[PDB]
Every structure is written in structure tokens, then in C-alpha cells.
């Protein structure tokens, strides 16, 4: 009779940086996706491979809730087959993705007068991420041919950059909290069902 803990994913007190995006595994519970879709707090709510109205009546084996924070103009990168700093180096969705992407403007929570520098993103990386891959390394990016030996400087970049996140920022540069629900149909007893 357990309700799925969607509250502690969406209404979580603090969110993770996009490079270290948090993942919650939902299993053995009953959830109502209609109430999520009913809520008008969300500015983005696009589903892929499945419709939201036919989501509270389909059983899945596991549901993964990935949550992180990015800025406005990067929200469009959280989709199958997109390019950019976020989709390439931080959080990549597969092309056969089956799930929904939810986002809402969190400028009232994630902005400081003077700048919130706690939310980071990976700016340099030698190659693109596989779908659903997380890279939390803090190694110096060797851009040139000379090795860096863990010394920051010329052709030796720090791989993480911080968002500005000031209240006076434009909407495209304001923080957005993203929750990506992915549904998997493992050949197994489907526990996560809708009601």
C-alpha cells in the first residue's frame, strides 16, 4: 500500500549539481502520475516513448528519478539527441528514452544576492558521456600535449565551472530544478504501478 516517494524527489530541500546529478530508484510502491501532471508548478513536462495520460495505468519494474539543477537556456538540452555542454559532459539521455522530463524555475530558492556558486557543471571533458553516465572526477583537464601532473594552469584546466545564479539574471540564466523520470520494463515482476 506504500505510496511512491515522489515528494522527497520533487519537494527535496536541496538539489544536486548537474555534474553529480542525484538518482533515486523507485520500486515496490503505487504512484499517481496524474497528480504530478495536474500540478501547474512545472514549466517543462515533456514525455518520450510514453504519454502522461496513459502513465497512471501502466506497470513498470523500476522507476529512476534523476534530479539536478541547470540554467534556463540549458533546459532544452535535457532531451534525447540534444547537444550542448550539459548533454555532452553532464547528463545525457539515450535516443530510445522512455520517460518524462520535468523542470521548474527555482530562482527564488537557488539564487543568492551576490551569486550562488554551489551549483557546478562540467565544462571540459575528453569525450561525450554515455546515456545515464555520471562523471564526478575532479582531475585537471589536459587540453594540450604536455601532461599536467595535477597542476592547474596553461593548457591545464579545472574541469568544473560554477553558475552565477543571481536574482537579477535573465530567465535563460536563472536556475531550474529538473526531475527526469525514466521507466524500465525489466523482464521481472513489475512492482511500480500507477493508480
Amino acid at each position: 500500500t506504500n505510496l511512491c516517494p515522489f515528494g522527497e524527489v520533487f519537494n527535496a530541500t536541496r538539489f544536486a549539481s548537474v555534474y553529480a546529478w542525484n538518482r533515486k530508484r523507485i520500486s515496490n510502491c503505487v504512484a499517481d502520475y496524474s497528480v504530478l501532471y495536474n500540478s501547474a508548478s512545472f514549466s517543462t513536462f515533456k514525455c518520450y516513448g510514453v504519454s502522461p495520460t496513459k502513465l497512471n495505468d501502466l506497470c513498470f519494474t523500476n522507476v529512476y528519478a534523476d534530479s539536478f539543477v541547470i540554467r534556463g537556456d540549458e533546459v532544452r538540452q535535457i532531451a534525447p539527441g540534444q547537444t550542448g555542454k550539459i548533454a555532452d559532459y553532464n547528463y545525457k539521455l539515450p535516443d530510445d528514452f522512455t520517460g518524462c522530463v520535468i523542470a521548474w524555475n527555482s530562482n527564488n530558492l537557488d539564487s543568492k544576492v551576490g551569486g550562488n556558486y554551489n551549483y557546478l557543471y562540467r565544462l571540459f571533458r575528453k569525450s561525450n558521456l554515455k546515456p545515464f553516465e555520471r562523471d564526478i572526477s575532479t582531475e585537471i583537464y589536459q587540453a594540450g600535449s604536455t601532461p599536467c601532473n595535477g597542476v592547474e594552469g596553461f593548457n591545464c584546466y579545472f574541469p568544473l565551472q560554477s553558475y552565477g545564479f543571481q536574482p537579477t539574471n535573465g530567465v535563460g540564466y536563472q536556475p531550474y530544478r529538473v526531475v527526469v523520470l525514466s521507466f524500465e520494463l525489466l523482464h521481472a515482476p513489475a512492482t511500480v504501478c500507477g493508480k
Epitope: 551569486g115 571540459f124 579545472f158 565551472q161 552565477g164
Partner: antibody, heavy 122, light 110 residues
Framework: QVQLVQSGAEVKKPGASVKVSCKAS????????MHWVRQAPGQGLEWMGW????????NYTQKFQGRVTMTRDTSISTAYMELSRLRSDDTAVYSC???????????????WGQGTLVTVSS | AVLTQPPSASGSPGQSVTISCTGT?????????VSWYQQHPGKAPKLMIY???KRPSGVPDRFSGSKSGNTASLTVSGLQAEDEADYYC??????????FGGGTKLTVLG
């Protein structure tokens, strides 16, 4: 519009220390490396070192190691340069210069501060 | 290790003048990261050339940079009165260090 506003002029005696500030505005302070350059009156430019306001890492040229200290406070977008054990020939205008490259150090400065005159008199 | 720069370069209005900047094989001749700055008296330096020959936006085409061996060169074609200032070259010197040149005063012969 980028603005690098430095602290006022300082008068010091040999053996003392000085702290110069450099508050940035008009851009994401953590996005660009900050350099420190001094210029003695009538003489030429002299590179001192750099700091990354993002990571906090620094590098100093050899002649200033052991006497210079570069820090930053991201909450106020200010870079600091501290010179200890001052001598007469340390009298110069100290300036903070922003690296024009984004999140990389490449040694080309596109915005300068107005300078901070530091006079070490007898 | 300072970059050797001639003390005075000069020319008549409309003439072309070249300011040299001789380093070593571990700064000028080692990397293509030579810069040139223009400083009018009492004002902050202005970036005129970066990466040997590239011009920032707004810098006149009359200013052009080049490099041969351990010696870089800043050339000013069509010399004008407002070009009278001090010019410093810069270069990466390895080990995360940059270095300046001694400086050259460019005088429009009056």
C-alpha cells in the same frame, strides 16, 4: 560592461605588508582568471602571477614567491594581492588584469583596473 | 628572464615602423602566445595583438604582429600622431609564467 575597481593608494614603510583589493563587476567573476601586474613609476610592466577565482589555484613568478599571496572572495567578487616584507623598489602601481579567455589562463588581458599606487618610502 | 625590446622606435607621419621583441627558445620561440600592449601616459595598457598576430576587435589593421625565431615584431603602417605611446610585448614563458618586454617608446618624429 566589465569594471575592475581597486582599493585606494597605500603608503608603507620597508618591512611592512600591504593588501590590495580588486572588485569585479559586469561578468561572472568565477569565469575568468585574474592576473596581477605592477609598474614602477616611469619604468615598465612586470607580471606577478595569476589566480583562478573559480578553483582558487594560483601561480606566482619566481621573484615574488615567499612574499606574494593571491586570494579571492567569491561572495563579493573581489581578488586580493598581498605583498609582505616590502622594500623601496616595490614602489609601483599594482593592477589587476582579467584574462580574456574563458576559464583558461592564456596571458592576454582585455580589462584592467585603475591601479593601486603603493609607495614604500624611506 | 626579461624580453629584450629596443628602447626607442620612431618614424615620420605615414611611415611604417617595426618594434622588435627578442626572447629565447623557451618563451617567444617556444610558444605562439606573444602579445603586444599599447600604453598612453597615465592610462592603462591596451591589448593590440595576441597570439603573435591576432588583433582584438577595434584595433586598427595598421597594427600587425609576426614572429620569426626567438624574435617577435610589431609593425605599425601609416604612422599617426595618436600612435605615440609605450609598447610592451608579452609571452608565455613556461611553467605557468608570463613575462613582459622592457618596453619601447614609439615617437612620431616632430
Amino acid at each position: 560592461q566589465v569594471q575592475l575597481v581597486q582599493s585606494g593608494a597605500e603608503v608603507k614603510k620597508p618591512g611592512a605588508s600591504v593588501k590590495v583589493s580588486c572588485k569585479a563587476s559586469g561578468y561572472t567573476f568565477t569565469g575568468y582568471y585574474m592576473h596581477w601586474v605592477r609598474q614602477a613609476p616611469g619604468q615598465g610592466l612586470e607580471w606577478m602571477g595569476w589566480i583562478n577565482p573559480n578553483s582558487g589555484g594560483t601561480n606566482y613568478t619566481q621573484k615574488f614567491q615567499g612574499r606574494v599571496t593571491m586570494t579571492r572572495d567569491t561572495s563579493i567578487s573581489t581578488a586580493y594581492m598581498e605583498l609582505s616584507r616590502l622594500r623601496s623598489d616595490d614602489t609601483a602601481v599594482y593592477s589587476c588584469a582579467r584574462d580574456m579567455a574563458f576559464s583558461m589562463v592564456r596571458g592576454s588581458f582585455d580589462y584592467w583596473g585603475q591601479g593601486t599606487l603603493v609607495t614604500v618610502s624611506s | 628572464a626579461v624580453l629584450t625590446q629596443p628602447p626607442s622606435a620612431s618614424g615620420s607621419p605615414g611611415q611604417s615602423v617595426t618594434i622588435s621583441c627578442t626572447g629565447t627558445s623557451s618563451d617567444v620561440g617556444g610558444y605562439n602566445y606573444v602579445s603586444w600592449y599599447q600604453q598612453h601616459p597615465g592610462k592603462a595598457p591596451k591589448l593590440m595583438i595576441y597570439e603573435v598576430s591576432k588583433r582584438p576587435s577595434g584595433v586598427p589593421d595598421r597594427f600587425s604582429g609576426s614572429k620569426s625565431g626567438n624574435t617577435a615584431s610589431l609593425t605599425v603602417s601609416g604612422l599617426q600622431a595618436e600612435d605615440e605611446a609605450d609598447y610592451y610585448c608579452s609571452s608565455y614563458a613556461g611553467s605557468n609564467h608570463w613575462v613582459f618586454g622592457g618596453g619601447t617608446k614609439l615617437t612620431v618624429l616632430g
